[PDB]
From a paper:
These weak interactions depend on dynamic and concentration-dependent polymerization by the DIX domain5, which transiently generates high local concentrations of binding sites. Signalosome formation by Dvl depends on head-to-tail polymerization by its DIX domain56, which also hetero-polymerizes with the DIX domain of Axin7, thereby recruiting Axin degradasomes to the plasma membrane.
To understand the structural basis for the polymerization block imposed by DIX54-Ub, we purified the hDvl2 DIX domain (bearing Y27D), and solved its crystal structure at 2.7 Å resolution. Like other DIX domains5, the hDvl2 DIX monomer exhibits a ubiquitin-like fold, with five β-strands and an α-helix. This predicts that a Ub moiety attached to K54 would create a steric clash with the head surface of an interacting DIX monomer, whereas one attached to K58 would be oriented perpendicularly to the filamental axis and thus not impinge on the DIX–DIX interaction (although we note that ubiquitin contains an extended flexible C-terminus, and may thus be able to adopt multiple conformations relative to the DIX domain). Given that K58 projects into the inside of the helical filament, stoichiometric ubiquitination of this residue might affect the filamental shape, which could explain why this modification limits oligomerization to a single helical pitch in solution.
Numbering used by the authors:
A (entry chain A), B (entry chain B): 11 to 91
C (entry chain C): 12 to 92
Write the structure that this text describes.
Amino acid sequence: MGETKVIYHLDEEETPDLVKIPVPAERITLGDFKSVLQRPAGAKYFFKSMDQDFGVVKEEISDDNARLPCFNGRVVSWLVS
Amino acid sequence: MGETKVIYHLDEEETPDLVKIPVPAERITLGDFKSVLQRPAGAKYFFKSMDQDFGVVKEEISDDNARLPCFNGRVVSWLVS
Amino acid sequence: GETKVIYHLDEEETPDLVKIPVPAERITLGDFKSVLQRPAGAKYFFKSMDQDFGVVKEEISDDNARLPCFNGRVVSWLVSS
């Protein structure tokens, strides 16, 4: 029980939408995010993430089972159509 | 089989995208990377490379057959135009 | 023959490595400039050895001047305006 704030940009848009998804941050998946958008497949989804060796990246994630990178209840995403 | 993480910057952008390509790091080529992106009107590709005498450098690579410099399953690239 | 020129642009931490198809025995500042298509009014410094002092970054502005090489390599720092 809990919610996650997903902040997402659609293509070249300057200002993202913020949506609250009623899945707690500890377990929110790409599948959870997709259910809320229902985007024509096949958008590609990138998320603000940390790479062990490199530092901050926009990580592409296409596996519905994959957990999304969160910080303080928040996910930050970029969509490409 | 195996995968490589390719971290790449597009022109003057601060934060790179990270994409996983399902070719193992021992054998990933420029051609492999290009097939996932699809090149502009001749983008130039630079990769974090190691010079035997100097240390870390950005090497331009334009040969599709050329293997990309990896460290720990990762390639780091900069793209121009 | 060819020379590997490793060069930094202003305060950039990682240099580009470019291969110039002039052998190291005769590569000049003019040769290097013709490949950059001189950003223009830039000053060029090269890792060099001074007889009395030791290692320095020697400014060179004469196109005819031969560049300091070690093992097929030149290391340069560029300053623009």
